Design a protein around this ligand. Structure first.
Ligand SMILES: Cc1cc2nc3c(=O)[nH]c(=O)nc-3n(C[C@H](O)[C@H](O)[C@H](O)COP(=O)(O)O)c2cc1C
Ligand SMILES: Cc1cc2nc3c(=O)[nH]c(=O)nc-3n(C[C@H](O)[C@H](O)[C@H](O)COP(=O)(O)O)c2cc1C
Ligand SMILES: NC(=O)c1cc(N2CC2)c([N+](=O)[O-])cc1[N+](=O)[O-]
Ligand SMILES: NC(=O)c1cc(N2CC2)c([N+](=O)[O-])cc1[N+](=O)[O-]
Lengths: 226, 228
């Protein structure tokens, strides 16, 4: 039944909540966590450039360094079965003349040469969109925030995938950007400036049943223009 | 054991089913129930501070679709043929501050945040301002604040597409549009509600007409790193 299918999926959306603390002795199995990451990997990205890395931070020392500067993750970092930093490619990786773009489109996407150079010429498709349409050249931040929006697609899907098999999660922005950037830079995670932190994500099994879910009414958030 | 591994396969199949659909079947329409389920996936999406700073605008009007089409080089095929077209709007910067009414009413009446919490949350140099200004540098400009809001709308966009694909419905996320012209069109149309909203990203839904090329993604060991 497609109606029972829809109910099941909506049950997962209700099940998923912002888990603040997980069961410290229950670990997501490796197959299950690979399924979660694959939901991330299969995510769509603007221009198909996949401007992200998923860093699985199981090392306890590093978790604790992050906990110290992440006032939104106080419960999640120590107790998560798996903890993920979602990195975005940095602004220098994303221009028409960046190696990463060129390699991504040629060797991953198998874009034919004639298409590539239409895409990456001066005032090509990529620049016409990045600069003219979306103003991503105004600052490195503007470029990176656009990258980071891509990463939130991967974040939702990983969270939704987990919930659909009954695994809890919590998206996490509650960190000091400067201090986290510095921590990861020093440790080599940002890879000589190819990456920067976008958002974090914890996964595991709930300890308590959550309070009921609250959302604005469909009537408030949906406008139709017939 | 094998049944759970099969449920995971069903899910992955939906993620493989979903693709950037360039053109839809203009006769096959998404049922009203099914599209309301898609929208529910958006509504139920998580958001920073649970502020749900979005509005979903379903643009079925042919005239408006075509006005948008004239300025959206990425949507040439999708806009005329989509069963449903959605503009994801984000709240603007002045809506998102600790003493904005949108924020105050959202947390007080939708989230039902109790009084001592909401006081710590919205007070000066309270939790919200310390996060917005100290941690994420969102006071630096209206765009920084809006792009943060806009990131949240991409959670709702992702869940809408995945939900659609789980029941066999195609989608296409769309950034290929001129912000300025699209902004002005939506202003003149009154869609942005006197500057409370601005355009974030758009999404088309419907039924494919062509089968897609094989999906390509970077290798798992290219996009995943473990720090054990
Ligand atoms: C991008 C993002 C960042 C978030 N940051 C945090 C965080 O740092 N710590 C936390 O406990 N919850 C965080 N949340 C959880 C929200 O408060 C929560 O999703 C919202 O209140 C809705 O409740 P629900 O997720 O249970 O439906 C975040 C949510 C999102 C989408
Ligand atoms: C945020 C976003 C915006 C996009 N913009 C457009 C667009 O304007 N027009 C279009 O045809 N495709 C667009 N795409 C589709 C991407 O090219 C596509 O998702 C990517 O190449 C991966 O291919 P797949 O989704 O077919 O797996 C967009 C995708 C995302 C995530
Ligand atoms: N009109 C286009 O050629 C276009 C534009 C965009 N958006 C970036 C401007 C995207 N895309 O976002 O994936 C993809 C395409 N494309 O068809 O490969
Ligand atoms: N440390 C917190 O109190 C905190 C921080 C954040 N992030 C914004 C800083 C979020 N949240 O993002 O939802 C939620 C909370 N919270 O527990 O209600």
């Amino acid at each position: 039944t497609e109606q029972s299918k829809k109910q099941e999926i909506l049950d997962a959306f209700q099940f998923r909540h912002a888990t603040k603390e997980f069961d410290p002795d229950r670990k997501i199995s490796d197959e299950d966590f690979q399924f979660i990451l694959e939901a991330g990997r299969l995510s769509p990205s603007s221009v198909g450039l996949e401007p992200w890395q998923f860093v699985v931070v199981q090392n306890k020392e590093l978790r604790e360094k992050l906990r110290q500067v992440s006032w939104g993750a106080q419960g999640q970092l120590p107790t998560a079965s798996h903890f993920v930093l979602l990195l975005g490619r940095t602004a220098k990786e994303m221009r028409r003349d960046s190696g990463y773009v060129a390699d991504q489109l040629k060797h991953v996407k198998k874009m034919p040469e004639d298409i590539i150079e239409n895409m990456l010429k001066e005032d090509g498709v990529l620049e016409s969109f990045q600069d003219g349409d979306f103003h991503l050249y105004e600052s490195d931040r503007a470029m990176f925030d656009w990258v980071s929006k891509q990463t939130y697609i991967a974040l939702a899907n990983m969270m939704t995938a987990a919930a659909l098999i009954g695994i809890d999660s919590c998206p996490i922005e509650g960190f000091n950007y400067d201090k986290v950037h510095d921590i990861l830079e020093k440790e080599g995670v940002l890879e000589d400036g190819r990456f920067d932190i976008s958002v974090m994500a914890a996964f595991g099994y709930r300890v308590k049943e959550p309070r009921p879910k609250t959302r604005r009414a469909l009537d408030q958030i949906v406008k139709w223009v017939e």
